[PDB]
UniProtKB/TrEMBL annotation, chain B:
UniProt record similarity statement: Belongs to the NAD(P)-dependent epimerase/dehydratase family. dTDP-glucose dehydratase subfamily.
InterPro entries in the record: dTDP_Gluc_deHydtase, NAD(P)-bd_dom, NAD(P)-bd_dom_sf
GO biological process per UniProt: nucleotide-sugar metabolic process
Example GO molecular function: nucleotide binding
Binding annotation for NAD(+): F15, I16, D41, T44, D65, I66, A87, T89, T104, K157, N183
Catalysed reactions listed for this entry: dTDP-alpha-D-glucose = dTDP-4-dehydro-6-deoxy-alpha-D-glucose + H2O
Name used for this protein in its record: dTDP-glucose 4,6-dehydratase
Keywords recorded for this protein, A-Z: Lyase, NAD, Nucleotide-binding
Residues holding dTDP: N182, V193, P208, Y210, R217, N252
Cofactor: NAD(+)
Keyword Nucleotide-binding: yes
TM spans (from-to): none
């Protein structure tokens, strides 16, 4: 049976990928052996994997730890890197750890994959590496122009992975996607922040003029796109996975308030968040040609996410208290 | 004593950085006379205090690492201009082991940009290379061009450019990026193409011609590169990239002929060896629109460079003992 190595698999998107793979949602990949490597930062959460606890081998570790990777990687058919620092606001406060994990950690992992001979490697990345597009969508040929330290670090990781592909023939593919939402997302991100604060009768933030535009995709659709790349993608190539809803932050705010029954009286207007980041939008014609298609309409996925947080306070309440 | 700006040069004991320092101290740039200069350099295999022997009365030297944020917080304040030449710069080394390239060329840049932000440094230049683009056999390049670096050195340099640009866009950090083709001139470490050729020929040894000799590169004399950088210092806009072009795009074949002409050598010494990227080409419309034009014609600069290596065996023979 195929043996899959998932770095960052105790976080939001990584744990979803693991739970889907272990549940048999990807036809063919049944009863796979699965190894999760995760350093369990503030964002790592083992409860995300509790339902597959006895199906997965968990190794606590840092993707920068080349010695540990050398022991653990060999024998795995597939490496997927979900390990990253991912909160833009944190990258604004101090970017040092973003460069360490999202650039140096990528080099460390790619070098360890080269030496261990892993045949399929997927580096998971973000549409924010491209910077703002006022009309239309970026294809995979688009120039990098990140605005935030988080996005510049993701971009730096992508560039070194592709240099390894071009220099050493490393069989790595890159995926890029817009903003994810869904169950088990750490409640510092905008959608779970809103839901959890509103369910507690507390305030929620609206940053700036609200006119920034983002693409929103349910985590299950992102992971299906990733699995498509695993099965049908080519070494050294980038693959976009595009949203199913494009929204200004004002529109997003209204949708979230409606979905939970909140009031605009709960919305704290907060000043500028720093950047040149008006609109991000990808074209995924390239991957849809390989057979990927999103299935989750935004309104249905949002409703399921609201119901999930409403029903799983025991999962998010300790996290809300830790954020304060 | 006067109010002429104080200039901080990271990597200033290297090839290009020490040239910039020497030009600045000599008074090559109008209105920058009497500059105080701080050089911060960790003196890797490529750093050389001999490169500054003549200007030590105007230069304060700090032996340290751009990744040392505490040190930067101490030494940066009071400098009006920060220029970053510190980097690992040999593509061949980056193939052997890229880890130090990422630490210096990416994490070191974030360290320096962050320390500049906290210190209130009003003008910053990140010095970079046309190698971030990857190969271009078809035409030339403008600063919007997409990034497709082929080597780990080029990818690390590209990562540095991006985090510097993110600091500009996120914080308004007043940093500009420059990108140029291959430099040549005095005080270049003899692992690089032209000084390896020259120094081996002077020791009676054979020199390489790379494959078909069809690979093409944009060549710029170090003094032109530095004058281009100073134009960005004086006239550039924060958050922008500027191309700095030289006066010779050459096949390796063409380059070999010029080198043999310049040293009075013969093709008997040239060995063809097996074969990186094919062609680098730079359009500098954005910076020429600011008054910069390259001024060293390639045949002239090469003749001066040959003169320099011929007269400086005491400098490069210890470095040649890398074999
Ligand atoms: N959340 C989004 O909207 C989004 C959108 C596009 C792409 N991405 C990318 O998807 C990946 C995962 O996203 P997420 O929302 O699940 O992030 P997350 O913040 O929920 O989880 C990150 C995981 O990585 C672990 N980790 C961090 N640094 C590590 C290191 N040095 N070594 C090992 N493990 C480490 C953490 O412990 C954590 O479990 C990331 O590469 C992110 O950049 C996310
Ligand atoms: N040589 C070229 O043809 C060329 C072309 C385009 C761009 N560039 C760029 O110009 C810059 C300077 O190039 P160069 O040819 O003078 O390189 P060099 O190898 O001659 O000098 C690099 C200098 O930086 C020092 N250094 C290295 N790491 C450091 C660190 N972490 N902290 C402090 N100092 C450190 C070294 O001691 C050395 O003195 C580099 O950023 C290079 O990428 C060079």
């Amino acid at each position: 049976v195929p043996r899959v190595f998932v770095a960052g698999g105790a976080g939001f998107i990584g744990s979803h990928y693991v739970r889907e793979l272990v549940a048999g949602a990807y036809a063919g990949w049944q009863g796979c052996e699965v190894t999760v490597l995760d350093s369990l930062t503030y964002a790592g959460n083992l409860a995300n994997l509790a339902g597959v606890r006895d199906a997965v081998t968990f190794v606590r570790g840092d993707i920068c730890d080349g010695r540990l990777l050398a022991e653990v990687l060999p024998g795995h058919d597939v490496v997927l890197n979900f390990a990253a620092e991912t909160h833009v606001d944190r990258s604004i406060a101090d970017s040092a750890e973003f460069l360490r994990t999202n650039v140096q950690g990528v080099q460390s992992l790619m070098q360890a994959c080269l030496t261990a001979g892993v045949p399929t490697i997927v580096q998971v990345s973000t549409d924010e590496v491209y910077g703002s597009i006022e009309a239309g969508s970026w294809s995979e040929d688009a120039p990098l122009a990140p605005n935030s330290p988080y996005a510049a670090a993701k971009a730096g990781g992508d560039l070194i992975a592709l240099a390894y592909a071009r220099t050493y023939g490393l069989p790595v593919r890159i995926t890029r996607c817009g903003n994810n939402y869904g169950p088990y997302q750490f409640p510092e991100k905008v959608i779970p922040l809103f839901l959890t604060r509103l369910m507690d009768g507390r305030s929620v933030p609206l940053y700036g003029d609200g006119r920034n535009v983002r693409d929103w995709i349910h985590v299950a659709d992102h992971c299906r796109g990733i699995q498509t790349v695993v099965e049908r993608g080519a070494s050294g190539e980038v693959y976009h996975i595009a949203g199913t809803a494009e929204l200004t932050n004002l529109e997003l705010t209204q949708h979230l308030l409606d979905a939970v029954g909140g009031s605009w009286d709960a919305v704290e207007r907060v000043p500028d968040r720093k950047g040149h980041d008006r609109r991000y939008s990808l074209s995924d014609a390239k991957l849809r040609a390989l057979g990927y298609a999103p299935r989750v309409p935004f309104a249905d996925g949002l409703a399921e996410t609201v119901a999930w947080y409403r029903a799983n306070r025991h999962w998010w309440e300790p996290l809300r208290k830790q954020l304060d």
